[PDB]
Design a protein around this motif. Structure first.
Motif, PDB file in Angstrom:
ATOM      1  N   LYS A  31       7.280  -4.388   5.866  1.00  0.00           N
ATOM      2  CA  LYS A  31       7.989  -5.584   5.447  1.00  0.00           C
ATOM      3  C   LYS A  31       7.177  -6.783   5.914  1.00  0.00           C
ATOM      4  O   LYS A  31       6.650  -6.788   7.030  1.00  0.00           O
ATOM      5  CB  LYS A  31       9.429  -5.615   6.012  1.00  0.00           C
ATOM      6  CG  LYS A  31      10.280  -4.395   5.596  1.00  0.00           C
ATOM      7  CD  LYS A  31      11.551  -4.226   6.430  1.00  0.00           C
ATOM      8  CE  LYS A  31      11.384  -3.105   7.438  1.00  0.00           C
ATOM      9  NZ  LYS A  31      12.506  -2.132   7.478  1.00  0.00           N
ATOM     10  N   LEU A  32       7.061  -7.788   5.048  1.00  0.00           N
ATOM     11  CA  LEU A  32       6.232  -8.949   5.338  1.00  0.00           C
ATOM     12  C   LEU A  32       7.063 -10.005   6.043  1.00  0.00           C
ATOM     13  O   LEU A  32       8.027 -10.540   5.483  1.00  0.00           O
ATOM     14  CB  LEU A  32       5.602  -9.528   4.072  1.00  0.00           C
ATOM     15  CG  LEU A  32       4.489 -10.569   4.307  1.00  0.00           C
ATOM     16  CD1 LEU A  32       3.390 -10.025   5.216  1.00  0.00           C
ATOM     17  CD2 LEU A  32       3.889 -11.063   2.996  1.00  0.00           C
TER      18      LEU A  32
ATOM     19  N   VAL B  59       2.376 -11.254   8.843  1.00  0.00           N
ATOM     20  CA  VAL B  59       2.283  -9.940   9.473  1.00  0.00           C
ATOM     21  C   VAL B  59       3.192  -8.957   8.734  1.00  0.00           C
ATOM     22  O   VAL B  59       4.365  -9.246   8.465  1.00  0.00           O
ATOM     23  CB  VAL B  59       2.597  -9.990  10.980  1.00  0.00           C
ATOM     24  CG1 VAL B  59       4.036 -10.356  11.251  1.00  0.00           C
ATOM     25  CG2 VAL B  59       2.271  -8.662  11.620  1.00  0.00           C
ATOM     26  N   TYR B  60       2.638  -7.804   8.391  1.00  0.00           N
ATOM     27  CA  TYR B  60       3.409  -6.683   7.884  1.00  0.00           C
ATOM     28  C   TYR B  60       3.902  -5.855   9.061  1.00  0.00           C
ATOM     29  O   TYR B  60       3.106  -5.429   9.903  1.00  0.00           O
ATOM     30  CB  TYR B  60       2.561  -5.819   6.953  1.00  0.00           C
ATOM     31  CG  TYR B  60       2.556  -6.290   5.516  1.00  0.00           C
ATOM     32  CD1 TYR B  60       3.728  -6.332   4.767  1.00  0.00           C
ATOM     33  CD2 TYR B  60       1.377  -6.706   4.917  1.00  0.00           C
ATOM     34  CE1 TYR B  60       3.714  -6.769   3.469  1.00  0.00           C
ATOM     35  CE2 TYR B  60       1.357  -7.144   3.617  1.00  0.00           C
ATOM     36  CZ  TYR B  60       2.526  -7.179   2.896  1.00  0.00           C
ATOM     37  OH  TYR B  60       2.497  -7.621   1.590  1.00  0.00           O
ATOM     38  N   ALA B  61       5.212  -5.656   9.137  1.00  0.00           N
ATOM     39  CA  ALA B  61       5.790  -4.782  10.143  1.00  0.00           C
ATOM     40  C   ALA B  61       6.872  -3.949   9.472  1.00  0.00           C
ATOM     41  O   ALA B  61       7.731  -4.490   8.764  1.00  0.00           O
ATOM     42  CB  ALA B  61       6.354  -5.562  11.325  1.00  0.00           C
TER      43      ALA B  61
END
Ligand SMILES: [Mg+2]
Ligand SMILES: [Mg+2]
Ligand SMILES: [Mg+2]
Ligand SMILES: [Mg+2]
Lengths: 89, 90
Positions: free
Chosen positions: B63-64, B58-60
């Motif tokens: 940031k991966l 997940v990219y949040a």
């Protein structure tokens, strides 16, 4: 457990949104969800519903194949099959 | 299903005795005399899902991250198990 690859469709994106939301209640700082990318893995947790035993039974000078079911909670046993003769394994 | 070999001994002998006792109540083969169970003896586990675990990239906040989510098989109750990162892209 057994594993499988699953695509990144809307179901998978909502799992990612769930992760970012839960992670915010721990507080990396406040994170904003972006996307789920490949690969995405699904692990199935398997638990026994019951068992089967598959036997080579010698009875009366004959080799038979017998299958016995066993319930996982009650452990109750039932005879499923009893064929023969069969060749020795 | 999951499969297993189990060794022979009094446990499998009683399974064989049970097999012959039950088949004798039907009697198409006549009255059978149990002798022994030989190798191999197989145990099949009939399996049902208790739940799942999902492993996500997940990219949040650009940031991966690496996240792990458990999900109940019946209720679908979800929990966040792990969340480590950032990590390199696969
Ligand atoms: Mg045994
Ligand atoms: Mg034994
Ligand atoms: Mg009998
Ligand atoms: Mg990006």
């Amino acid at each position: 457990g057994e594993w499988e690859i699953i695509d990144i469709g809307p179901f998978t994106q909502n799992l990612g949104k769930f992760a970012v939301d839960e992670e915010n209640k721990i507080g990396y700082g406040r994170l904003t969800f972006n996307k789920v990318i490949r690969p995405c893995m699904k692990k199935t947790i398997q638990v026994p519903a019951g068992y089967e035993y598959q036997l080579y039974v010698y009875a009366s000078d004959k080799l038979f194949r017998a299958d016995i079911s066993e319930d996982y909670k009650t452990r109750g046993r039932k005879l499923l099959r009893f064929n023969g003769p069969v060749p020795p394994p």
